[PDB]
């Protein structure tokens, strides 16, 4: 499939960014897209070989695209603005006008100041003894709170390895102050196991939240810890 | 040539989901393309056709004899088919364009619903879990800003072949209690409160 | 005599008995030699030359390429033919017929007509002259008009009438220009 | 091979010389349009076809494919250059000559390979830049080409014309004379 790097990008306004797209091998045509919930899917620029025929579709004189090799392509957004915050998508087809296959995108978030950036607080909530005695099941609830800017990925790790069965994460994080623009977010997730599995104390349950924040390149003036890209977890053991 | 399709669709899991698309201004050379975006991900190609009723491993596409209308058939709808489905027309040099599409939500049958509001403890601030409720009941956002209520999301225990809907509520407020937590929505009459 | 390397691609459509017979032959030509081609009647890429063998086997192993080429007879040929029917096929340019003596020789200049389909006859009186005629080939002016010159060896005498009979699809009645001594 | 109507949708050509390229659609041996790859616009030949729109992005991207294909074929053939063919030049008028009236002089340059030619008109040895038009390179079955130049004029008994054709397949510049008689 079509590869895209980085998966996420949190940057301050006026900075320059590079978005890489590794297309499917043998595909001579590459397409660049912009997807925002507000603005729909916007076609930016395409390539047939190593040269782009139409330079239109690009928003401003800050949006440029290069594909020197004739394979991997780079999209460069220079001196970034808040309006540029979007999921940048890339597609490839063997030839121009051919069936297009899309990559995973790049979630780009541009901010006014990095003073509003915060890592999440992860808490694991043990199942209700009422639930165990009623439905004979055990629901573990996870809470990721007070994080900006919201590039997070929640996962559950039972007895060392990751799980998918009996899990449900929210599709969109909620605003803690919905009236405010610059508002911290919250995300919940449910892990439901059999009462017997929870009853065994040898079983370990850990909730993992992958936050994408600052980097070594970015500056930090505040007293608190740099809200850098990190993993924040919350663990719980079985209760007999 | 442009396409129009129902903005939202709710279908029961296990039964075939038929998604309609209207494209009256289509020309002979133009293809009908179907893409889907499961929520947090890039689009995914399903099928495409010109005239014949195409079928592949994923789904099937049926184009009418007058070519002005087409349908996407997902043989046995699952929770994995819950995504926004785009019907697009191709095309010359013009290029791809996504509309609002069809936001398809695949609903599960809840065999025996036992709605209950459970209070969980930290391994503070205490959370209220509204679970084992009907897929027909709709949960509403909290009126008070100091209280936080997530929308319902369906759990899938393939280990036991069991599915359940669940909504979470929390607040640091002294007023907050599991009794008044989901008092903002049309909560069923037979809801369990320990 | 500089060096020069040429590559050609010809997406060619062949129509017979109107819409009845349609055949697409997409030719990939290196210099003056066709290396590989796609024919609608065969349904796959087949190399004409050894130089086309790596392209054919490659493109045939690609499902997206084959689908596009197999549907091209309808998308390109059968489709574009509908646009020709109201345009190029409907083009009718009536010819201009002029007789000029050259007198032992007589040349019938039939100029500026379309389509290329034509029939022109020489007549002596009511007799039709076939043995003493030599018609030039069909000259293509290149600006969507054709012309043809039909020469006749004749022995003129008083009272003789030499008629040039021209038949074109743009005419429901022939144009018969006469030359008198 | 045998059909009522033959069409090329289209004639894709790209040579290393310029490097230059050409995009055209042909129907029954006549040029329907060309895409000015520089100006990025479709120039239709017949005024009826101007009711249609051909996206120049099609031609531009098709030429981007031939650029790739040409370099690949140069490597595979091990730099097998094109052999320069001996062209065939013919000069004729669009209609019969009568001096007072307006006529067009036509210069057919057939059997062109590689498609690199310089067609110029001369009046009593002096070059004429006025009223001269030229068609695009028109495809041939033997994967060679043919081009046609025009010279709009008013025939004169004393004024003579010559067609100056330049091609690498010629040892010296070819000049085909035209006598109004």
């Amino acid at each position: 499939g079509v590869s895209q790097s980085p998966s996420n990008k949190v940057t301050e306004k006026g900075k320059d960014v590079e978005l890489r797209c590794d297309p499917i091998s043998g595909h001579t045509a590459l397409y660049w897209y912009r997807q925002s919930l507000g603005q729909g899917l916007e076609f930016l620029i395409y390539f047939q070989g190593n040269s782009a025929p139409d330079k239109s579709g690009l928003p401003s004189d800050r949006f440029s695209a290069e594909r020197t090799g004739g394979s991997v392509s780079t999209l460069t957004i220079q001196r970034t603005q808040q309006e540029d915050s979007a999921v940048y998508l890339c597609a490839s087809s063997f030839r121009f006008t051919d069936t297009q296959y899309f990559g995973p995108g790049t979630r780009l978030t541009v901010l006014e100041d990095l003073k509003n950036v915060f890592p999440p607080e992860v808490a694991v909530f043990e199942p209700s003894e009422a639930e165990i005695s009623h439905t004979q099941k055990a629901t573990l609830v996870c809470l990721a709170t007070g994080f900006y800017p919201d590039h997070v990925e929640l996962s559950w790790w039972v007895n060392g390895k990751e799980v998918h069965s009996g899990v449900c994460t929210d599709p969109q994080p909620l605003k803690e102050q919905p009236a405010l623009n610059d508002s911290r977010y919250a995300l919940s997730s449910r892990l439901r196991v059999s009462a017997t599995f929870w009853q065994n104390p040898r079983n370990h349950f850990r909730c993992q939240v992958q936050f994408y924040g600052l980097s070594e390149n970015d500056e930090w003036t505040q007293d608190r810890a740099k809200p850098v890209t990190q993993i924040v977890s919350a663990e719980a053991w079985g209760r007999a | 040539m442009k396409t129009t399709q129902p903005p939202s669709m709710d279908c029961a899991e296990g039964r075939a989901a038929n998604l309609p698309c209207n494209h009256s201004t289509i020309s002979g050379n133009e293809y009908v393309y179907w893409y889907r975006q499961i929520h947090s991900q890039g689009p995914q190609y399903i099928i495409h056709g010109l005239k014949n009723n195409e079928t592949n491993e994923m789904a099937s596409l049926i184009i009418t004899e007058d070519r002005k209308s087409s349908t996407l058939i997902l043989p046995h709808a699952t929770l994995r088919d819950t995504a926004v489905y785009y019907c697009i027309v191709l095309g010359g040099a013009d290029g791809l364009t996504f509309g609002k599409g069809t936001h398809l939500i695949i609903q599960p049958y809840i065999q025996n619903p036992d709605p209950a509001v459970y209070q969980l403890r930290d391994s503070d601030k205490s959370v209220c879990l509204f679970t084992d409720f009907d897929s027909q009941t709709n949960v509403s956002q909290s009126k008070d800003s100091d209280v936080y209520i997530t929308d319902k999301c369906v759990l899938d225990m393939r280990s036991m072949d069991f599915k359940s809907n669940s909504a979470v509520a929390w607040s640091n407020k002294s007023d907050f209690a599991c009794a008044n937590a989901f008092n903002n929505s049309i909560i069923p009459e037979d809801t369990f409160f320990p | 005599s500089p060096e020069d390397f040429v590559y050609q691609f010809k997406g060619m459509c062949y129509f017979t008995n109107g819409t009845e017979r349609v055949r697409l032959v997409s030719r990939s030509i290196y210099n003056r030699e066709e290396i590989v081609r796609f024919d609608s009647d065969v349904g796959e890429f087949r190399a004409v030359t050894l130089l086309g063998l790596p392209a054919a086997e490659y493109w045939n192993s690609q499902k997206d390429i084959l689908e596009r080429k197999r549907a091209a007879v309808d998308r390109v040929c059968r489709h574009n033919y509908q646009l020709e029917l109201r345009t190029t096929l409907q083009r009718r340019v009536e010819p201009t017929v002029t007789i000029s003596p050259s007198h032992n020789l007589l040349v019938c200049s039939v100029t500026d007509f379309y389509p290329a389909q034509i029939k022109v006859r020489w007549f002596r009186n009511d007799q039709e002259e076939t043995a003493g005629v030599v018609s030039t080939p069909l000259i293509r002016n290149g600006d969507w008009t054709f012309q043809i010159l039909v020469m006749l060896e004749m022995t003129p005498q008083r009272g003789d009438v030499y008629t040039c009979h021209v038949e074109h699809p743009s005419l429901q009645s022939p144009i018969t220009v006469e030359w008198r001594a | 091979i045998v059909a009522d109507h033959v069409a090329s949708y289209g004639v894709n050509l790209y040579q290393s010389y310029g490097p230059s390229g050409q995009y055209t659609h042909e129907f029954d041996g006549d040029e329907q349009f060309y895409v000015d790859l520089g100006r990025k616009e479709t120039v239709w030949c017949l005024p009826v076809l101007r009711q249609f729109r051909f996206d120049p992005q099609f031609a531009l991207t098709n030429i981007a494919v031939l650029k790739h294909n040409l370099n690949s074929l140069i490597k595979r053939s091990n730099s097998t250059a094109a052999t320069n063919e001996v062209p065939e030049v013919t000069v004729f008028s669009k209609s019969p000559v009568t001096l007072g009236q307006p006529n067009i002089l036509i210069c057919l340059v057939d059997n062109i390979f590689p498609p690199v030619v310089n067609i110029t008109w001369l009046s009593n040895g002096h070059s004429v830049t006025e009223g001269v038009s030229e068609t695009s390179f028109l495809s041939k079955s033997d994967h060679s080409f043919f081009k046609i130049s025009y010279l709009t004029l008013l025939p004169s008994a004393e004024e003579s014309y010559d067609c100056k054709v330049e091609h690498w397949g010629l040892d010296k510049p070819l000049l085909k004379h035209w006598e109004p008689e």
Binding site: G26, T28, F94, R95, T97 | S27, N29, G92 | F9, G11, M12, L24, S26, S28, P54, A55, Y58, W59, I65, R68, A72, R75, V76, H79, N80, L83 | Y9, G10, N12, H25, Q32, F52, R53, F54, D55, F58, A59, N62, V65, L66, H68, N69, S72, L73
Partner: peptide
């Protein structure tokens, strides 16, 4: 609009 035939890229 007249539909054009498409040349595919030569390997590789």
């Amino acid at each position: 609009a007249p539909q054009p035939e498409l040349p595919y890229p030569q390997p590789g």
